[PDB]
Amino acid sequence: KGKPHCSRNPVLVRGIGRYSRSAMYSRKALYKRKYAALATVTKPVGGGTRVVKLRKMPRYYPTEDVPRKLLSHGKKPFSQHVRKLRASITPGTILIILTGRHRGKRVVFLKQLSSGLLLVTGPLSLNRVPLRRTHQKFVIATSTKIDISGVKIPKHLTDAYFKKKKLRKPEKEKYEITEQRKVDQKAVDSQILPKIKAVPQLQGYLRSVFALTNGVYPHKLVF
Amino acid sequence: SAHLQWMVVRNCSSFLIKRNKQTYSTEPNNLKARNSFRYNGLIHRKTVGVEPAADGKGVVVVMKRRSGQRKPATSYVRTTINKNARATLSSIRHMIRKNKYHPDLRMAAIRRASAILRSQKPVM
Amino acid sequence: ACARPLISVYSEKGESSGKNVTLPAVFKAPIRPDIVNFVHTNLRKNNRQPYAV
Amino acid sequence: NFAELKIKRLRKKFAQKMLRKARRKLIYEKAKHYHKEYRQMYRTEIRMARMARKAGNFYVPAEPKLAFVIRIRGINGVSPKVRKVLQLLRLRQIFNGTFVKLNKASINMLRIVEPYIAWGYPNLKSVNELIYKRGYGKINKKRIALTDNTLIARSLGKYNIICMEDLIHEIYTVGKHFKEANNFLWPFKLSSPRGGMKKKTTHFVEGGDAGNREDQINRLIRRMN
Amino acid sequence: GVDIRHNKDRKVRRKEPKSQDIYLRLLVKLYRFLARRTNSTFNQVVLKRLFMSRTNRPPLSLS
Amino acid sequence: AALRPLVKPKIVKKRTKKFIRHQSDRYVKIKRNWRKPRGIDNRVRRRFKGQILMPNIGYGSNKKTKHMLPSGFRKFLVHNVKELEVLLMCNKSYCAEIAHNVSSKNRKAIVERAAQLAIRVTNPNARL
RNA sequence: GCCGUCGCUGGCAGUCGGCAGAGCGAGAAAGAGAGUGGCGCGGACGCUACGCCGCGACGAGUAGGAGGGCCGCUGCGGUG
RNA sequence: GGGCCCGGGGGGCCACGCGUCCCCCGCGAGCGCACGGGGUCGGCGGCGAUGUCGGCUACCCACCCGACCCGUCUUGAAAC
Ligand SMILES: [Mg+2]
Ligand SMILES: [Mg+2]
Ligand SMILES: [Mg+2]
Ligand SMILES: [Mg+2]
Ligand SMILES: [Mg+2]
Ligand SMILES: [Mg+2]
Ligand SMILES: [Mg+2]
Ligand SMILES: [Mg+2]
Ligand SMILES: [Mg+2]
Ligand SMILES: [Mg+2]
Ligand SMILES: [Mg+2]
Ligand SMILES: [Mg+2]
Ligand SMILES: [Mg+2]
């Protein structure tokens, strides 16, 4: 066996390579790369030994069964889908949340998680929005950007980090802010907050909520 | 012959039920109660029947012998199986495949046996 | 359709008497449900009494 | 012994693949050839005109051999002679389309149905898009989309038309078997013109839509294909 | 709307025997299979004449 | 917690209103049972806009969900325990309806047996 | 997309299983031919053939014709 | 311009074994991605036992658009 080699045909456009068949034929040196033509486990027992079937026939059969589906292609699971991000959402961009209890608040975009959801912070001390996931379709990307290129976001802050844990009821069960989250909030905030205060009137801008008022029309105004 | 006897009874039989846009057959040795040439339990030389035992324990597998085709009293051989669920199905599968006795009724016989045994569990 | 086996004669006690009769040929005749229904249909009208106002 | 039969089974599959692979090369190279041919036809017309303009003369190009015909009127109140001619063109429905190779016999049929059709000369792009998006074959008298090349080859193969490119070349250049390749195609079902019409009830030269609009049919084909 | 007539769409021809005879229909089952699964046009002709009516099946004399 | 069918496809009805007969709102003598209007001037027969509609084979239901109950099953009237057992091998597609004229005594046995065979009953709680 | 009609007078008896070997939709007649010399015991559904399945086109209607009604009413032979 | 874009002295080719005779001068293997014979997620969230959830249709009400009374003779009927 040999180590995999990166494709020698760069992509020109999706589905079309840069090089033709004969061009690739030479690049791959195919002129010299020519080539020519358990179900049971035995166990001892206290007979002497028994041949044991690893998988047993069903003990039941429903009266009816559905047939097998026809085969398709291109229907991937969610985890294998490509994630897209609006070009207007770069790290350090200020976004306006449009849904949930934090609607109208202006928050700082940190990064896009593997699931495709965005990660944002208020920061908490400015508008009481913590490290929280938000969906890009439900945010307005303003044109205001702070430079958070030097901010080290903890690497454990992943989709699994922010996934909700189920709470059971038989009265009521209350969510609790784990001490780890508080520690993570301070670590990230301590780096973003000084950079927000570098821009005049920006911390006050982040404290203030977005709302439409008389005569103000979203299609007319720049964000 | 079976085919000739199916032309007589396919739409004229005391065992024929037509109702609610559905058709069934109530004769013995019909594994699916289906008005069908394949599943009819009277017109073929060889037939398979699965019924519950006289007591609600086990199944009775009925096989039609080859010889007495015109002698209804000795025509059918009954066998009671009262093993565990998986062992009962294996015997039915072997009684059909190994003997090559209507191999086209193998899963219908196995599905009917699983439905009788399941009905013999305690009702929740 | 040319098989005429022997048919057992049974005794009044429900056992084979040992005597046999060859199956009469009439039991191998064509079975025609449509001829029977035609004949049963038209013969069953022959015992009717007339009615009229 | 089964192993000997399996090799026979495999060697039959290999041969079919090797024949299938050689056929792909044939259609690949026919298209490469047609591309060159179309370019020479396009360039040759320009060169003939340029050399006539140089000498102070006029180069008069050959009258078109191909017309595309669209029925622009409904089916209510059609006179018997128009009704028969529209049936022979296979335009039995409004906005149906067909290619019609031009000659004295056919040009005079198109004159009888002048109020009921918009026609004109399609360019190479019109023949491409018409047959790719909306091309259906008449196979065993059924309307089958030409989704695979074998569909063309089984019916027109005897005329050496074995791929969509061979079909487009027979139609566009009006080849020896235009009649067969063109009857093979089901009449094109075109949509309502997007962007509207001018006046379907009068001639194109009157500011309407009926009649011969020459190369201007291509604009109409873009909006209906 | 499509300009076409519909008076001739339905073809008048027997797809089966009008007879309810069960022996004739067993022969039709037989020759339906043979006509379908063999390339023999003779089977198709016989299958067609099994559907035919009494007057379309004249008796053939010995002479 | 009721027995479920093998599949539960969405049931699509082209029309859910009934086809009420023409002029049956105007008289009591005209019942709402559909009658095809056949008068010469009848504007319903001519399909004038805004008038009572007429049934036609276009309203036909999808063959896959036709005669299907909202639960996903198809009913089958039964009069006794013996008729019930025909549904033993199709208990995942066909349910049981007990006929109206079966006495309260016998309904207990039919309902009792149906539970054992995993057959669903549409009207098990009647005549208690 | 769904319903029906018509057409293909289309396809399916091959459910040919451990007495096994799964194919015959494919551009272009005719054989997945036969030979003679040089561990496991397993493999969904189907087929009321008056059944089931596929593909394409089509659908106005008085007078009038024809088909199908597991439409409805009363009584008779059978059967349940 | 046409002649597999004839013959001689930086960029793409659906050229790429060979012994030759010479015109001319019949089965490699694997692995993987996919604009590939019609949709999937191997993606998630909220709410729920006395006032709430679902209920096409049906009972009543409202609104917007549509809307003349049937049968009949009749070229023509909502017809004064
Ligand atoms: Mg007009
Ligand atoms: Mg527009
Ligand atoms: Mg006019
Ligand atoms: Mg139409
Ligand atoms: Mg008509
Ligand atoms: Mg007619
Ligand atoms: Mg009138
Ligand atoms: Mg009609
Ligand atoms: Mg109004
Ligand atoms: Mg009158
Ligand atoms: Mg008058
Ligand atoms: Mg009137
Ligand atoms: Mg008046």
- Contact exists between A and D (3 or more beta carbon pairs < 8 Å): no
CA–CA distance, C20 with C7 (Å, rounded to integer): 5
Dihedral sign, CA of C19, C23, C25, C27?
positive
- Polymer length in residues for chain B: 124
Contacts of F107 (CB under 8 A, 6+ apart): F98, F126, F127
- Contact exists between F and C (3 or more beta carbon pairs < 8 Å): no
CA–CA distance, B41 with A5 (Å, rounded to integer): 66
What's the per-residue H, E or C state across chain A?
CCCCCCCCCCEEECCEECCCHHHHHHHCCCCCCCCCCCCEEEEECCCCEEEEECCCCCCCCCCCCCCCCCCCCCCCCHHHCCCCCCCCCCCCEEEEECCCCCCCCEEEEEEECCCCCEEEECCHHHHCCCCEEECHHHEEEEEEECCCCCCCCCCCCCHHHHCCCCCCCCCCCCCCCCHHHHHHHHHHHHHHHHHHCCCCCHHHHHHCCCCCCCCCCCCCCCC
CA–CA distance, D154 with E37 (Å, rounded to integer): 23
CB pairs under 8 A between A and B: 23
Q: Three-state SS for D215?
A: helix
Residue A121 burial (CB < 10 Å; 0-12/13-18/19+)?
buried
Between the CA atoms of B72, B75, B80 and B81, what dihedral angle is there, to the nearest 10 degrees? -140
* Strand G nucleotides within a 7 Å radius of protein CB atoms: 1-13, 15-18, 25-28, 32-34, 39-50, 55-63, 70, 76-77, 79-80
CA–CA distance, D57 with D29 (Å, rounded to integer): 39
CA–CA distance, E28 with E58 (Å, rounded to integer): 19
Dihedral sign, CA of A115, A117, A122, A127?
negative
CA–CA distance, A19 with A7 (Å, rounded to integer): 11
- List the one residue out of D98, D118, D83, D99 whose CA is nearest residue D206: D118
CA–CA distance, D221 with D225 (Å, rounded to integer): 6
Neighbours of D179 (CB within 10 A): 12
- Please give the protein residue whose CA is closest to the C1' of the nucleotide H74: F40
Distances (CA, A) of A39 to A55, B33, D184, F59: 7, 37, 57, 55
Q: Report the half-sphere exposure of B43 (CA within 13 A, side-chain side).
A: 19
Q: Which candidate in C32, C39, C41 is best for mutational testing of the E interface (most E CBs within 10 A)?
A: C32
Contacts of F110 (CB under 8 A, 6+ apart): F78, F80, F81, F84, F96, F98, F102, F121
Residues of B in contact with F74 (CB under 8 A): 20-22
- List the one residue out of B48, B49, B38, B32 whose CA is nearest residue B2: B38
CA–CA distance, D30 with A157 (Å, rounded to integer): 58
Please name the amino acid found at residue A20: S
- Polymer length in residues for chain F: 128
Q: Do residues F68 and F5 make contact, with C-beta atoms less than 8 angstroms apart?
A: no
* CA F36 – ligand 6 centroid, Å: 23
Q: Do residues E52 and E14 make contact, with C-beta atoms less than 8 angstroms apart?
A: yes
* CA D194 – ligand 2 centroid, Å: 7
CA–CA distance, A32 with A26 (Å, rounded to integer): 10
CA/C1' separation B39–G56 (Å): 36
Per the CB < 8 Å rule, is F117 touching B21?
Answer: no
The rounded Cα B111 to chain-centroid distance in angstroms is 11
Q: At what angle do helices D149-156 and D164-172 cross, to 10 degrees?
A: 60
Q: Do residues E14 and E51 make contact, with C-beta atoms less than 8 angstroms apart?
A: yes
Distance from CA of B92 to the nearest CA of A (A): 13
CA/C1' separation E5–H68 (Å): 37
Between the CA atoms of F106, F112, F118 and F121, what dihedral angle is there, to the nearest 10 degrees? 50
The rounded Cα B108 to chain-centroid distance in angstroms is 9
- Contact exists between D and B (3 or more beta carbon pairs < 8 Å): no
Neighbours of A94 (CB within 10 A): 22
Region of A198 (left: φ > 0; alpha: ψ -120 to 50; beta: rest) is alpha
- Does A179 touch chain F if contact means CB atoms closer than 8 Å? no
CA angle, residues F53, F56, F59, in degrees to nearest 5: 90
* Ligand with smallest separation from the Cα of F58: 8
Please name the amino acid found at residue A23: A
In eight-state DSSP terms, residue F50 is T
* Ligand with smallest separation from the Cα of F50: 9
- Does B4 touch chain C if contact means CB atoms closer than 8 Å? yes
- List the one residue out of F47, F49, F24 whose CA is nearest residue F35: F24
Tokens linked to C46: 């022959």
Tokens linked to E35: 């006509």
Strands (E) in D34-127, as ranges, are 66-71, 96-101, 117-120
Distance from CA of A65 to the nearest CA of F (A): 7
Helix or strand (DSSP H, E) at D5 = helix D3-54
- Polymer length in residues for chain E: 63
Per the CB < 8 Å rule, is E1 touching D74?
Answer: yes
What's the per-residue H, E or C state across D150-181?
HHHHHHHHHHCCCCHHHHHHHHHCCCCCHHHH
Nearest nucleotide to D40 (CA to C1') is H1
CA/C1' separation D2–G52 (Å): 36
Contacts of F123 (CB under 8 A, 6+ apart): F97, F98
Give start and end residues of each alpha helix (H) in chain B.
2-9, 85-97, 106-119
**Range 58-77 of A in CB contact (< 8 A) with F:** 62-66
CA–CA distance, D95 with D85 (Å, rounded to integer): 16
Neighbours of D57 (CB within 10 A): 9
CA/C1' separation B34–G3 (Å): 28
Helix or strand (DSSP H, E) at B76 = strand B76-81
Per the CB < 8 Å rule, is F118 touching B118?
Answer: yes
Tokens linked to C40: 């049963």
- Polymer length in residues for chain A: 223
Tokens linked to D43: 């360039």
Neighbours of B8 (CB within 10 A): 14
Dihedral sign, CA of A97, A103, A108, A112?
negative
Q: Do residues D122 and D168 make contact, with C-beta atoms less than 8 angstroms apart?
A: no
Please name the amino acid found at residue A181: R
CA–CA distance, B52 with B113 (Å, rounded to integer): 8
CA–CA distance, D68 with D95 (Å, rounded to integer): 12
Query: Radius of gyration (Cα) for chain B, nearest Å?
Result: 15
CA–CA distance, D42 with A27 (Å, rounded to integer): 36
In eight-state DSSP terms, residue C14 is S
CA/C1' separation D166–H22 (Å): 35
Nearest nucleotide to F80 (CA to C1') is G80
- Phi first, then psi: what are they for B62, rounded to 5°? -105, 130
What's the per-residue H, E or C state across F88-101?
HHHCCCECEEECCC
Tokens linked to D199: 């006046």
Distances (CA, A) of E30 to A202, B54, E26, F41: 91, 44, 6, 55
Tokens linked to D111: 């004159």
Residue F13 burial (CB < 10 Å; 0-12/13-18/19+)?
exposed
- List the one residue out of D135, D78, D69 whose CA is nearest residue D102: D69
Please name the amino acid found at residue D138: K
Q: Do residues A104 and A97 make contact, with C-beta atoms less than 8 angstroms apart?
A: yes
Tokens linked to D109: 């049929």
Distance from CA of B19 to the nearest CA of F (A): 7
Own/partner pairs for B75-82, CB < 8 Å, 24+ apart? Answer: B76/B29, B76/B49, B80/B53, B82/B53, B82/B57, B82/B58
CA/C1' separation A47–H3 (Å): 91
Helix or strand (DSSP H, E) at C21 = strand C16-22
Resolution (A): 2.7
Residues of A in contact with F3 (CB under 8 A): none
Strands (E) in F39-94, as ranges, are 77-78
Chains within contact range of chain F (3+ C-beta pairs < 8 Å): A, B
Paired with F96 in beta bridges are F121
Distances (CA, A) of C47 to A99, C34, C36, D210: 89, 22, 18, 81
Nearest nucleotide to A54 (CA to C1') is G40
For chain A, after which residues does the C atom lie more than 2.5 Å from the next written residue's N, i.e. where is it broken?
Answer: 37, 46, 170
Per the CB < 8 Å rule, is A66 touching F89?
Answer: no
* CA F49 – ligand 9 centroid, Å: 12
Residues of F in contact with B21 (CB under 8 A): 67, 74
* CA F19 – ligand 7 centroid, Å: 24
Residues of F in contact with A64 (CB under 8 A): 6, 90, 92-93
Please name the amino acid found at residue A74: G
Neighbours of F69 (CB within 10 A): 15
- List the one residue out of D220, D222, D212 whose CA is nearest residue D66: D212
Q: At what angle do helices B2-9 and E22-37 cross, to 10 degrees?
A: 120
CA–CA distance, A107 with A119 (Å, rounded to integer): 10
Distances (CA, A) of D128 to A9, A39, B79, D89, D178: 30, 58, 73, 21, 16
- Does C1 touch chain E if contact means CB atoms closer than 8 Å? no
In eight-state DSSP terms, residue F60 is -
Q: Do residues A122 and A170 make contact, with C-beta atoms less than 8 angstroms apart?
A: no
Tokens linked to D220: 């109409």
β-strands D211-212, D117-120: how paired? parallel
- Please give the protein residue whose CA is closest to the C1' of the nucleotide G7: E9
CA–CA distance, B33 with B29 (Å, rounded to integer): 9
